[PDB]
């Protein structure tokens, strides 16, 4: 397939005999790739679970939002710590989580019951799901929990841990409400004190070793990996390779794994725009994470080929048609010229022909006019003369 232009019309139609006609084909084949890895300046030594431990576990009605900023974080250790009972990660793979970067990590520590991490999930039912700690439906992050019966309990349990089960409205996502207000359930008002049909809406947990597993203590840290339009402050162990420009390889830039040819750019950004998009929301240009240099992505391995041929009944001499490539030694770069020989004859040499339909190299150009037997496009026609 990867030897002649005739040899790759012969693969796109799955027949060893072609006919006479213009044959729009497929891939230009071979294209050797390697890898480019670029990920920024980093602070190192990160607040892991080794600062999210020991004593002072945060309250379930009074948690905080631990602002983890610039660090490198090996996320494989937190998966392979082998002490945590439930991971369920939301659009992110837990195993290959270390091959990504984010702008910040939002950890939220609180202790709940044993039947409630089926409710700490996006869009769940129940009271303490929607009245105590709400998650968005399009959440991009994990949930981490484990039994803490021998650490989060005393004799008779803690009266410091208070879930809220009554509130007039449901919570917004990630919302905190640290109020200690009495709520009213019935006709007789409360007005700051208790009494008939007044319920105290915070509720103390019962933490005993004789108590049930579904009410056992169970701290939950929820890691929100959000992706803003800031530079990536938090990353993982992605040791960095160089920056080779042109020669199409697979790459990864701030977690955006793609494959393309890397060129210098003429394009202007903002202070913190790491990614430039497209009309149909793909990738056109990426800010380099290290040197803050503009780059440009374009696909390789294609030009617009339509091999014209007189058929294999006549001869094996063919000619090509690139579509928007204007052949001023540009399909040295369009057709990425690292292919095997007996293609480079039909790329740049003699028999260069400029047409509105793009360039046709490998055939004659004749100042006379004749008939059409193999139509090409934009007012030209070839044939086969002996």
């Amino acid at each position, epitope marked *: 397939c990867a030897l002649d232009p005739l040899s790759e019309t012969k693969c796109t139609l799955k027949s060893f005999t072609v006919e006479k006609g213009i044959y729009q084909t497929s891939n230009f084949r071979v294209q050797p790739t390697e890898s480019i890895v670029r990920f920024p300046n980093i602070t190192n030594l990160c607040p892991f679970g080794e600062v999210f431990n020991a004593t002072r576990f945060a309250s379930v009605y009074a948690w905080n939002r631990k602002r983890i900023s610039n660090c490198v974080a090996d996320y494989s250790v937190l998966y392979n710590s082998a002490s945590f009972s439930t991971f369920k990660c939301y659009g992110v793979s837990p195993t290959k989580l270390n091959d990504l970067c984010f702008t910040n990590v939002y950890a939220d520590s609180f202790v709940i019951r044993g039947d409630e991490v089926r409710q700490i999930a996006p869009g769940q039912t129940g009271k303490i799901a929607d009245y105590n700690y709400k998650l968005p439906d399009d959440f991009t992050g994990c949930v981490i929990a484990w039994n803490s019966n021998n650490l989060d309990s005393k004799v008779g349990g803690n009266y410091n841990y208070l879930y809220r089960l009554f509130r007039k409205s449901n919570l917004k996502p990630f919302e905190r409400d640290i109020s200690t207000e009495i709520y009213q359930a019935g006709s007789t008002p409360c007005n700051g004190v208790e009494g008939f049909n007044c319920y105290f809406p915070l509720q103390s947990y019962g933490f005993q070793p004789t108590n049930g597993v579904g009410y056992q203590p169970y701290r939950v840290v929820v890691l929100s990996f959000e992706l803003l339009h800031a530079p990536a402050t938090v990353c993982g162990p992605k040791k960095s390779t160089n920056l080779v420009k042109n020669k199409c390889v697979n790459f990864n830039f701030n977690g955006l794994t793609g494959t393309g040819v890397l060129t210098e750019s003429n394009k*202007k950004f903002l202070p913190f725009q790491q*990614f430039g998009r497209d*009309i149909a929301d793909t990738t056109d240009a990426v800010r380099d994470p290290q040197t803050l240099e503009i780059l440009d992505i374009t696909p390789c391995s294609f030009g617009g080929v339509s091999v014209i041929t007189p058929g294999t009944n006549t001869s094996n001499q063919v000619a090509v048609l690139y579509q928007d490539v204007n052949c001023t030694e540009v399909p040295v770069a369009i057709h990425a010229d690292q292919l095997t020989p007996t293609w480079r004859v039909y790329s740049t040499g003699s028999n260069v022909f400029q047409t509105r339909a793009g360039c046709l190299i490998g055939a004659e150009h004749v100042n006379n006019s004749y008939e059409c037997d193999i139509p090409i496009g934009a007012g030209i026609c070839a044939s086969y003369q002996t």
Partner: antibody
Amino acid sequence: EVQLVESGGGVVQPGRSLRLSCAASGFTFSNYAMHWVRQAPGKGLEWVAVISYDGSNKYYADSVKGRFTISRDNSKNTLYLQMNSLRAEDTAVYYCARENNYYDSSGYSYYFDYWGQGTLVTVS
Amino acid sequence: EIVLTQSPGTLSLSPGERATLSCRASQSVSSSYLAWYQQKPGQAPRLLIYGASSRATGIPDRFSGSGSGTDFTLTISRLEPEDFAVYYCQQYGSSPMCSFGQGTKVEIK
């Protein structure tokens, strides 16, 4: 030459809607980022908004966010600023500006190379 | 959030000498991500200094600015009559925001 010809001014009653247009010529409009820039009479000048070359990266100012919105269309080389619910303190001259970035090895410099001609928008 | 402060609000000097304008921030502005502009009165602003040190195209060497940290200056020696306009300091790095100062108009004494 480069031209950022803009239009959309006049006298508009409060609470109505408007759509300022910054047409561009002389360069590639999808190669550069875009800026909306405003000036009250008798004061200094107050920044409004920024959108990128593609539209995926928008930012607005603190007294701007919500009502004002920004968009672009690259096929006609035009920048769009859409006005919802106008208030009498928004009597200002509006300007479209482009962001040209002189790169260096020690950083990344930022400036406003080319501007519009100013469109007066009065809210009364 | 960086607010930008200038002093004075309007300066009046005779033509031919040096004109001194000052700009002041709220934080430590890193690597001078600011610029200086000329709003001719009634007209659009026109860029003079970029990076608080380097002149633009069509902009002579009589305008010269410098600064670091917080206090930022502009010095215009030999005052031609086309140089009397309103000048600004304008940040754009550090935050995603763009913030202006209140500026100074240069007049005739």
